[PDB]
Each structure stands twice: as C-alpha cells, then as structure tokens.
Symmetry: C2
Subunit: 200 residues, 2 copies
C-alpha cells in the first residue's frame, strides 16, 4: 500500500515520472497551480501546509524547480535569487520540512541536471542549483533518521523538449523522459542513498 508524494507531476519530466510510479504505488500529486494538493515551493508556509494536508507518506519526489537563464554578464544577484528561492532553496526546503512526513525507510528524490557537469551559455544559475542540491543530498544521506534515504536524479536535456531547447544545447544528444523516469523509480524502489543518478 505504498504512498508517494510527487511534486511537479504536471511538467514534462514530472508526468513521465508519474507514469512509472503509479503502476506500483498510490501517487499524491502536488504543484503550484494543479495537483491533489497545491504548493508554492518558494514559500515555507505553503510547504508546511502541504505536509499537514498530505500526512505520512513513504517517498517524497521532486520533479520541480525553476532557474533563471541569463548571460553571465547580465546575471545580477536579483535575477540569481529566483533560482536560489526555487530550484535550489525550494527543493532543499521540501527536505528540511518533510523529514517528519516520511515513514521509516521512506525516501526523498530531488532533481538536478547535466548543466553542473556539462556547462552551457546562460546556464551558470541552473548549474549553481544543480551543484547545491547534489552536494546537500550527498551530505544529508549520512544524517537521515529512521532508515530514510535521499538521492538525486540528473537529467540531460529531454527529447520531449528538444524542439524548444536545442538552440541552448547545440551538439547535445537528448534523452527520453521515460528513461529519466526510470532513475526516479530506481531511487524510490531501490535501497541506495546519497547517490546522484546521471541520465546523460
């Protein structure tokens, strides 16, 4: 009777993750504007209320988070802050505020991405977030109570986004969202922790 809170279920990645997870578990979806529950991951009061409504689950999965894309020389601290509050801080806050919502031996899975290891123009801000979430999870894994696990999934650019994203990722070879969704399933239904699962 396994129960998974999936935040970001309506996105491209999120919907491919839901497709795989829902075949073996009861998925509760959450998103900014749609889902079984709504949540603004940039607002800690919102995250706290989502956890109140949701109750106890076995896995919390984040396929969500926004980053500013800007040329470096026009990336100001003010623009950079939107990434910090969402793809970086928002994801990390789900963990900081969600540990008590997981059953024993439950898991967290967060999203990162290839831009941290394979940089592109406009991508410094996304890279920052990806590095931050990867390292936070590696470290947090050693301190989780009650047998809880935490991993990250690092996607390449998705085939399903190649039409819109190719000019940003010239010479890259995109990956299917369904291939990426498999690493989320590996995280949820596997037993490893502190891993960064690359789907490049």
């Amino acid at each position: 009777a396994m129960k998974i809170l999936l935040i970001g279920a309506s996105g491209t990645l999120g919907s491919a993750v839901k497709e795989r997870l829902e075949k073996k578990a009861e998925v509760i979806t959450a998103g900014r504007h749609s889902g079984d529950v709504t949540v603004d991951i940039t607002n800690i009061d919102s995250i706290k209320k989502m956890y109140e409504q949701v109750g106890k689950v076995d896995a919390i999965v984040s396929a969500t988070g926004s980053a500013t894309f800007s040329p470096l020389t026009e990336l100001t601290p003010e623009k950079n802050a939107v990434t910090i509050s969402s793809k970086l801080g928002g994801q990390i806050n789900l963990v900081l505020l969600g540990i008590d919502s997981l059953n024993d031996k439950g898991s967290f899975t967060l999203t990162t991405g290839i831009m941290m290891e394979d940089p592109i123009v406009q991508g410094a801000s996304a890279a920052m977030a990806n590095g931050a979430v990867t390292a936070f999870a590696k470290s947090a894994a050693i301190e989780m109570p009650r047998g809880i696990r935490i991993n990250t999934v690092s996607p390449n650019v998705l085939e399903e986004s190649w039409d819109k994203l190719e000019p940003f990722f010239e010479g890259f070879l995109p990956v299917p969202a369904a291939k990426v969704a498999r690493a989320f399933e590996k995280s949820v239904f596997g037993a490893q922790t502190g891993e960064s699962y690359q789907v490049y």
Copy 2:
C-alpha cells in the same frame, strides 16, 4: 606584470596563509567584515558594490570568506539554512556577479569551497550545499567570462591549524597545512587554468 589582488577574508586562518604567499608576488589589498584595507559585508549587495567602487581595477579577486550554518540535519531549518545561502553560497557568488567589471583583462576569480561536499560529516549538510553550489557555478561561469578572465575554486580539507578545535567533528580525517592550501590559490591566481576545482585533501 605588476599584479594587484583583492583578498577577501584575509584575517581568517586560511585567508592569512593565502595573504602570506600572494604578498611575495603582488600588491594585496585586504578586505573583511570588520578588518582590512577595505571592508565588506558579503551578505549585503550594496556593501559589495561599495567595496568594488572603493577598490577600482584589480588583476585578481580572491575569496577566502563565507560562512555556513553547522547544525545537525534534523535541527537545520529553512531559517538556519538561509544564513549559509546569504554568505558562503550567495555572498561568494555575488562577489563574482558584482566584480567582473573590476577585473583587468586576463584577470581571475578564486573562490573557496571545502571537503564537506565530497567527504561528508554530521552537521555538514548546509556547508556541503554551499560548497557544491560554488563549485558548479564556477565551472559553468568559466565558459562565459569576458576579456580572458579566469575562475577557479579551491577546496580544502580541515586545516592543521584548526585541528585543535575541529577534531571532534572530523574524527579520523587527516588535516592539511594551511600553507599547502595557499599554494592552490597561488596556482589559481598566477597559473592560466579556468573552470577548475583544486582539491587540497
């Protein structure tokens, strides 16, 4: 040829070892919160901008500064984690976002990370985050730098000169001399590489 370096965090254990090396080869302008030729609160954007107006053009900007909350994971709240975000993480990155215009052609940035992102310890999650964030930012930023500017990071292990206080938290680690880590900073300033993370473990 005549090198000018802005060293932020110069009064710290690491910073002062860095100053000692770089001094021999360049003019070092020191900066800190309460100490230095120029002062700066790196958590405050206008304060960083004022520092850079005061300083003018330099050849290198070196950050051996930035603080991270050192709390057990289950005690680490969003509020506590926000401190790291404004300082070791956001403070060091903002020195880059606000300082490119202060670098001479072919100048460099050097930022500080740490072993806690790679060889984690209890209480280290927030510093790990900051270190990972800064490492990845620098690697990506390196490809967008104008005018031949370089950017690297230095990632130290626990320092021998801090081992007295830090040993209970790093049991079984083997600490490194601050003098050895300072060589990596010299490598970043005086060498010609970019997008590098120089581990001194």
